[PDB]
């Protein structure tokens, strides 16, 4: 019954081409509600789920500013990055930024999160405790180094417990009625002979509403994950997630198969047969 | 509600 | 918003003296004591930490659910006297982040 | 490593003009323009984010800046009136947030 609310920012460097590119996104568990596009027209904030939309003035005034601050410090950062590792002002190279926190379901602040990426590589991230650093590189270790003597783990510890479960308490409740409802996925089965002894049986769950769920294929020995063909969890658009997985079966075997799912929505988990 | 970020690295 | 003791404070050589500064906006993030001499520049004094920093006679704490700060100078001398001023870090409402100052508190040591 | 500013003093006739200099060798990417009045804390006339671009603050009117370099970052009075009769100072920070050092102050008495 656990939540998370997480902002994952990405600033581009284009060199050539003006200051980097910076994109930020705003979830709340699988389910995003805010954006900001230095790119886009407005400098602003932007509304991304219908729940959010009725934030007064001072609330997308207060973001916006906390948001184009933080393209502000990742440009820079973006310069730093390009001096500890002595690289040439030529390409384009990338900055992430994840963090937020996790909330139970009225149990409360359980964990937060601060994380950097430079290139796709960790760079820093704050510990489970909040109060130490992980610098993933030599030079990561120049920014522990000064971020410890600055305290700025404090800052983001009074963020992680406060401000961020300050938010996402409410905007759970302003969108209780889509935040947490949970969709169980639709199963149904397909049977497509691929050669004349052979046959390939499809699993699909569809319109689940968390991203999280199981699919697992079953021959008469309970398991048999190694044969199994499974396909990356994706986003149908209209708030649900689809799944599927595959398995190859003998022709005339079809009943020695069978598929499990398991999802949050379903009170026990799907037998599924041909 | 979004970070505070100012801290360079 | 912040303040402070309206002051002056008028303490003999060697008193325990403390400071009192508020801060209005809940989102602040940095704090600071700064100390400027009479008639000469601001000075970073320490910034305050609310684990507690202390720095020989200067300690000096934070809470944050109060909004409060204080400053406690151990051993006065006169090489203390000075306007003693609460600085506080808040993102102000654009994408900047500012520090407000406080109008401070005069300290004036006499031996 | 520190925070230099020129003049020390000056007396200005109403309708003068001046212009205070500011430098800092610090590598910093901030600077800032305070004004200090007695009864009141210090107040922002203009302040410079990064080179190349600055931005207003508490006390804007009747004031103009221009930031150089990153070294530099100047502040003119183009019509000097007595309610510009003050104790300027020029500061400096690392980026936004971090603790400003400042500078030695330039002494105003905008009086005929």
């Known amino acids: 019954g656990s939540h998370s609310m997480r902002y994952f920012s990405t600033s581009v460097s284009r060199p050539g081409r003006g200051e980097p590119r910076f994109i930020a996104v705003g979830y709340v568990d699988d389910t995003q509600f805010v954006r900001f596009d230095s790119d886009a027209a407005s400098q602003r904030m932007e509304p991304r789920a219908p729940w959010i939309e009725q934030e007064g003035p001072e609330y997308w005034d207060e973001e916006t500013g906390k948001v184009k601050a933080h393209s502000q410090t990742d440009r820079e950062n973006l310069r730093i990055a390009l001096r500890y590792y002595n690289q040439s002002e030529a390409g384009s190279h990338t900055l992430q930024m994840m963090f937020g926190c996790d909330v139970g379901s009225d149990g409360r602040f359980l964990r937060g999160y601060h994380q950097y990426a430079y290139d796709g590589k960790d760079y820093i991230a704050l510990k489970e405790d909040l109060r130490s650093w992980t610098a993933a590189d030599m030079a990561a270790q120049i920014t522990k180094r000064k971020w410890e003597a600055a305290h700025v783990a404090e800052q983001q510890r009074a963020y992680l417990e406060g401000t961020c479960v300050d938010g996402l308490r409410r905007y759970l409740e302003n969108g209780k009625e889509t935040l947490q409802r949970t969709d169980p996925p639709k199963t149904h089965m397909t049977h497509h002979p691929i050669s004349d002894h052979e046959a390939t049986l499809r699993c699909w769950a569809l319109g689940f509403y968390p991203a999280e769920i199981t699919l697992t294929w079953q021959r008469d020995g309970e398991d048999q994950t190694q044969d199994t063909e499974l396909v990356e969890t994706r986003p149908a658009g209209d708030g649900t997630f689809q799944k599927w997985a595959a398995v190859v079966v003998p022709s005339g075997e079809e009943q020695r198969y069978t598929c499990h799912v398991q999802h949050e929505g379903l009170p026990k988990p799907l037998t599924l047969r041909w | 509600n979004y970070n505070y970020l100012y801290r360079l690295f | 918003e912040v303040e402070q003791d309206p002051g002056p404070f008028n303490v003999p050589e060697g008193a325990t003296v403390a400071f009192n500064c508020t801060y209005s906006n809940s989102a602040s993030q940095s704090f600071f004591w700064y100390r400027q001499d009479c008639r000469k520049e601001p000075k970073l004094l320490m910034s305050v930490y609310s684990s507690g920093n202390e720095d020989g006679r200067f300690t000096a704490q934070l809470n944050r659910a109060s909004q409060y700060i204080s400053l406690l100078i151990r051993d006065s001398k006169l090489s203390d006297s000075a306007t003693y001023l609460c600085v506080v870090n808040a993102h102000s409402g654009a994408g900047s982040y500012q520090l407000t100052f406080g109008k401070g508190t005069k300290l004036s040591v006499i031996p | 490593a520190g925070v230099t500013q020129t003049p020390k003093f000056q007396v200005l006739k109403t309708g003068q003009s001046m212009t205070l200099q500011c430098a800092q060798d610090?590598?910093?990417?901030?600077m800032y323009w305070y004004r200090q009045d007695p009864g009141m804390g210090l107040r922002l006339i203009y302040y410079?984010?990064?080179?190349?671009?600055?931005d207003k603050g508490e006390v804007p009117n009747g004031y103009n800046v221009s930031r150089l370099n990153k070294r530099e970052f100047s502040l003119r009075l183009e019509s000097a009136a007595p309610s510009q009769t003050s104790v300027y100072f020029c500061?400096?920070?690392?980026?936004?947030?971090?603790?400003?050092?400042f500078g030695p102050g330039t002494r105003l008495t905008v009086t005929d």
């Open positions: 610090m590598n910093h990417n901030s």
């Open positions: 410079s984010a990064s080179e190349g671009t600055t």
């Open positions: 500061a400096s920070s690392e980026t936004g947030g971090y603790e400003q050092y």
